[PDB]
């Protein structure tokens, strides 16, 4: 809806109907730092990537292969939604999963373990 900016962008018209996914990438499991969170990106699904039959190089024909990764990063969900809405893409927002901080204490390691009652 409201693809006027999409119309005036000048990009090929056939790429204005692409379905896109909006999400905030989660923290990687292999690292414990949280310096790569809170930034939203549009995920064009550049699925088609065949293999060059000369050297095994990965060829592609999708112009949006790495745009959403290398560039085009948004500081908020609203900005990304407004951007996709302005360019007339059928976006689909995926809310991120956030950790739930729980009361954790060192002393919980060392519990009385009850009373040696017969059982």
């Amino acid at each position: 809806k409201r693809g006027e900016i999409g119309k005036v962008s000048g990009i090929p018209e056939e790429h204005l109907s692409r379905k896109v996914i909006i999400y905030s990438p989660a923290r990687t499991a292999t690292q414990s730092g949280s310096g790569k969170l809170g930034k939203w990106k549009i995920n064009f699904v550049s699925t088609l990537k065949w293999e060059n039959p000369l050297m095994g190089w990965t060829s592609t024909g999708d112009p949006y292969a790495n745009v959403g990764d290398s560039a085009l990063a948004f500081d908020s969900e609203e900005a990304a939604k407004s951007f996709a809405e302005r360019h007339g893409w059928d976006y689909k927002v995926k809310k991120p999963n956030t950790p739930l901080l729980k009361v954790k204490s060192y002393s919980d390691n060392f519990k009385w373990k009850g009373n040696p009652q017969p059982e």
Binding site: S32, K104, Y106
Partner: protein, 230 residues
């Protein structure tokens, strides 16, 4: 400020919320919430090697040290419970020189096999060394070494590059539910292993690959296949 990583704080008791000063910015946290978690609430990210939010708290590796105004020694923020009205200090010369001093000890016996480490691009040791570390490097003598003992067809182990953070041991003892991995020895030269020929036979036994920060435990099927950036 907003919590780092979007972490949600669940106040099971609205009345009990002690107010602390992480770096001069007062925040409210419930009972418990060790100094590390209080800083996590206030948007401050503290280095950590032994502390996993899913396992029991251990105090080794002394990397999350911070300075408290009413404390002579730097305290382990990952273990010291929060108290009302603390004046915590993170960006302080004491709390910094603590971190470089600890990480120098961490790196003094680490092997020089970064180009062949399967966790080269996503290692917490080097990523934190670039930020919270001194660039010079002072150690010059001979390092130690540990031989590699096979365990499992899908967990490739190089225990030479293993900081003894005991995270794998706690995971195997608590989450996995099978007690096969333990810490053996005393002093400089303690090893971690099964002490026998047994392999890790558990359904969720492949999670030791991610939970171990350094490249000591890495997946065997993914041995040297690709780097994280590609």
């Amino acid at each position: 400020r907003n919590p780092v990583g979007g972490a949600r704080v669940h106040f099971s008791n609205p009345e009990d919320a002690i107010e602390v000063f992480v770096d001069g910015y007062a925040v409210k946290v419930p009972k418990g919430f060790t100094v590390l978690q209080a800083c996590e609430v206030a948007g401050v990210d503290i280095p950590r090697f032994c502390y996993h939010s899913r396992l029991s708290i251990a105090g080794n590796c002394r990397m999350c040290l911070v300075e408290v105004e009413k404390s002579p020694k730097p305290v382990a923020s990952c273990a010291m419970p929060a108290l009302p009205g603390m004046k915590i200090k993170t960006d302080t010369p004491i709390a910094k020189k603590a971190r470089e001093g600890v990480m120098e000890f961490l790196l003094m016996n680490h092997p020089l096999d970064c180009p062949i480490c399967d966790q080269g691009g996503e290692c917490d040791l080097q990523d934190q060394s670039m930020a919270f570390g001194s660039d010079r490097g002072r150690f010059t003598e001979m390092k130690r070494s540990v031989v590699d003992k096979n365990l499992g067809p899908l967990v490739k182990t190089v225990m030479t590059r293993c900081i003894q953070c005991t995270r794998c041991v706690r995971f195997a003892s608590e989450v996995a539910g099978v007690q096969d991995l333990g810490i053996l020895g005393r002093g400089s030269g303690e090893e971690i292993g099964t002490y026998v020929e047994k392999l890790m036979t558990s359904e969720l036994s492949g999670n030791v690959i991610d939970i171990c920060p350094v490249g000591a435990l890495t997946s065997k099927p993914f041995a040297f296949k690709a780097r994280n950036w590609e």
